[PDB]
């Protein structure tokens, strides 16, 4: 049991993956120069909850903009216009000892999903709802949204094969917490915050979760991020 | 077939410019010669872009980030004379377009056009990496338009040019239908975070769009 | 000045040389490399990540997520079974291993397996995993899997079982049962039902010969 | 004699090549290099040249050099504004700088910003000139240009006060507005109103790579 | 499009000789082969002068003093018989010129002249720095004449020579209407003396008359 601190966010944590065997840095010139906040940011952003229940398929985050709410990350997103960080993703279950499962949590870098028939596009508010994530389906869905059916998550691939991206296995009969970190993979140095989504933290259950008919019929999955090593374009006149 | 000792060790042909590098055609067109001062089909196209046909779109889709110089050969006949001389002009992606055989962009010096008359060997024109980021980009999470505007998936870092291609006779006496088959080819290529490969079928060339595909063919029983 | 002459194949176009093209933008100097995290410098880095494998891939459920779920709790019948060939066959044929082997038409190496028992910490059992050598038949029996090649594997004790495959290459494949050794003993608390992953990769090294097109894409 | 085969791409004329042309008078010898004054031995040292910058651009007042004059001499609205983009801002476009810019698609750098009060010796007052990043807003108020990025420039003290504005490239851009700090104070001898030029250049170095041809010309 | 971190340092595009040298299409020209035998329309003329178009004239009014070896290639086609041989006769700027496509000048030993026959690659001739100064002007305030007489503008120092274009073959049994493009490229260039580009329009290819244009695109006000 280890209780990880940042600024003042404290945590209770029980092995890293980190993405592609790098760890997150800062982008070491006059003519652009950026700035690096280091003060809050880096502090954890505990999102909201969320309930697994039996028939749970599946749920998805869009970074950078899911906290676009977030303190002074989300308010650092409206001030300047390029921007980058690395984004420790802690997932905890605490589930009890009883409760059976397994979760995938990947985080799928530039996860463009498609839409659900097929000839039109989405109207932009169905790719994310900031902190609340979106859900998939069991089954094929239609209308102006995201096609949102486990067995092609959003990409067109196969969900099994979707462990190619850094992820963590979340099995409740051994273990219950992942740490992913995702070092800002782009092929430019900065980009916008608000138009493109570095990666998709995508949680989806692969066994499902069973208990019997005395326990809570739910398990609530926690997700906390931590904004590392973000930097942004400066404001001031050289 | 019978199952025999295959037995070696290698995989330099499993390596990335071992397994992009090879040269497919990407275009097919046709272009006529006379008639129709002011027409569209005198002249060919071809914004160049990896989702041409699905057989090599598959491949580049096994990579997120990737950068490569292209070498492209023309392969260009004719049916139905003097002796003809094609013009196949390479826009950047910052470049005026023709709109007709005769525009005045044809004339652009800062546009690089082979002039290939037949009877040769195949014209062959070299691209660098254009990109303005530091690689072209298979998928774009993103919107064009700030502020989650239209045009979804759709980013500018990835655009490769134009190839405008025309004969530079001014005319004939009969009609001659010339025929071009543009072979692209990926060089000096490197590719960045690998990604699980495609499942379902291609709907449309620019969208990722898809129906919903079995992970496999099925089988019976989970025992036979 | 030099006497040249030109032999056959000149003038011609193959379409697979490795000529010096001609550059069409000589001026033109290109953007400077920046360091991008996670490149393949080789196909074979992508076989050698494991991924979940359809083995419950009947009639009606290989639309949903019960593809990858094996259903563990009748002994007399194995759990689950299947060819161990990457290419031309339904479990593996779509995995990031069987799909990266389709692209070629020699390839030989090896495969491991692993097993997640995605049950409950309290739920307790055996089961055993019997291999087949690619020339030999399946048992039909426990007793005559367990007279091969086989390793019970404690559920309670290890969560995970690790196998590799040997002799798996193409230019009549093994098997890998899995039979009921014990029940799945579970306390009054937990559930009864549980499921088991399989996942799939290049064991040490995999060879790779003779590119081809992929028989998927239409 | 020497087997050689001719690869694709021979007996092609590609238009950017550097091959080495035949010259049509080998015996003819040129004229020896004088020494000539001022030679250019790259574009971006005409960039960095500063140049008058025509600001106030208004309707009726582009063919005179009223373009060129901000007048100076309503506290409650900015003296001038204007996009800070060397290409397609109406200000910025037929600059040096921002003419040795339309002849190429890619571009990034700094640009310099020179504001000489042309006014008299004994005019004295404060103008605040802001600047606001490319994705923020434009101050609509003096105060809000305040918390900002300014620079009260005194001109009483100084008549020339120098910007250098970084994050100048295309491939939604800053803006350079200006405030009434203070009025022109002026003595009973000297006129009430004044002007104000402007200039820019490149601050420290410029990159640009993609030439094309300029809109400009028909 | 949207607004991307253009990251890079590099300012060998801007150099002068990958700024003016590229090669671009400054002579399109007719020419018969038969009938006529004192006509004009047999042969191409273009005295060599960089005032030809405006695109590239503009780049050579960016300095005052540039010299510069000049490697042209002809691109030459043919309508309606034989094998084609053409004749690209350079003069020197004191050279005889032909009146006829049958006179003497044609076969004079100090005018250069390539014999291309159709279907192989495209003629290539290079021309020296000709010029008696030190540098081609493009601009020349002052007289050819003195005492301020006629011809305002015009010096002899940049005179670049002329381009006789024929066909060799004698005559035909059909008429073959001939067309070439000339593709003009400095090479070598050094430039002196930088200069404020064009603003207005271009009138005549021998003058720097224009007509008065404003300064920039208007706009509403001074705040907008």
Known sequence: ?238 | ?224 | GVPVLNTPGSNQFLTSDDYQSPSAMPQFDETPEMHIPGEVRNLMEIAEVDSVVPVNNVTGKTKSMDAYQIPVGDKTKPIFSFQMDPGYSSVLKRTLLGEMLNYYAHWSGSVKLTFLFCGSAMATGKLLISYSPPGASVPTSRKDAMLGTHIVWDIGLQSSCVLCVPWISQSSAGYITCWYQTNIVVPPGAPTSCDVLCFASACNDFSVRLLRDTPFMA
């Open chain 1, 1 to 238: 049991v280890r209780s990880m601190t940042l600024g003042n966010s404290t945590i209770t944590t029980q092995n890293v993956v980190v993405g592609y065997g790098e760890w997150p840095s800062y982008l070491s010139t006059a003519e652009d120069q950026p700035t690096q906040p280091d003060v809050a940011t880096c502090r954890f952003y505990t999102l909201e909850s969320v309930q697994w229940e039996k028939t749970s398929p599946g749920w998805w985050w869009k970074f950078p903009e899911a906290l676009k709410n977030m303190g002074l990350f989300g308010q650092n997103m409206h001030y300047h216009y390029l921007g980058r960080a690395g984004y420790t993703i802690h997932v905890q279950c605490n589930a009890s000892k009883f409760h059976q499962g397994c979760l995938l949590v990947v985080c799928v870098p530039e996860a463009e999903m498609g839409c659900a028939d097929t000839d039109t596009t989405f109207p932009a508010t169905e790719l994310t709802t900031e902190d609340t994530p979106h859900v998939f389906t069991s089954d094929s869905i239609t209308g102006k949204k995201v096609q949102a059916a486990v067995c092609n998550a959003g990409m067109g691939v196969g969900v099994g094969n979707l462990t190619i991206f850094p992820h963590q296995w979340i099995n409740l009969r051994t273990n219950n917490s992942a740490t992913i970190v995702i070092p800002y993979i782009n092929s430019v140095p900065m980009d916008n915050m608000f138009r493109h989504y570095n990666f998709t933290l995508m949680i989806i259950p692969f066994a499902p979760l069973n208990f019997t008919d005395g326990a809570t019929a739910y398990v609530p999955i926690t997700v906390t991020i931590a904004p590392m090593y973000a930097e942004y374009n400066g404001l001031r006149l050289a």
């Open chain 2, 1 to 224: 077939q019978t199952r025999h000792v295959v037995n070696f060790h290698s995989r330099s042909e499993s390596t990335i410019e071992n397994f992009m590098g090879r040269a497919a055609c990407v275009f097919m067109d046709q272009y006529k010669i006379n008639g129709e001062e002011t027409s569209t089909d005198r002249f060919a196209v071809w914004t160049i872009n990896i989702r041409e046909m699905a057989q090599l779109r598959r491949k580049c889709e096994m990579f997120t980030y990737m950068r490569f110089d292209i070498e492209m050969t023309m392969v260009i006949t004719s049916c139905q004379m003097p002796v003809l001389t094609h013009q196949i002009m390479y826009v950047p992606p910052g470049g005026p377009i023709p709109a007709k055989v005769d525009g005045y962009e044809w004339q652009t010096s800062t546009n690089p056009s082979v002039f290939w008359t037949e009877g040769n060997a195949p014209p062959r024109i070299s691209i660098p990496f254009i990109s303005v980021g530091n690689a072209y980009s298979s998928f774009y999470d993103g919107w064009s338009h700030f502020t989650q505007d239209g045009t979804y998936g759709y980013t500018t870092l990835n655009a490769m040019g134009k190839l405008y291609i025309r004969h530079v006779n001014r005319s004939s006496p009969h009609q001659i239908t010339s025929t071009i088959r543009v072979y692209f080819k990926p060089k000096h290529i490197k590719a960045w975070v690998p990604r699980p490969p495609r499942l379902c079928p291609y709907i449309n060339k620019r969208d990722v769009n898809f129906v919903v595909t079995e992970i496999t063919d099925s089988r019976t029983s989970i025992t036979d």
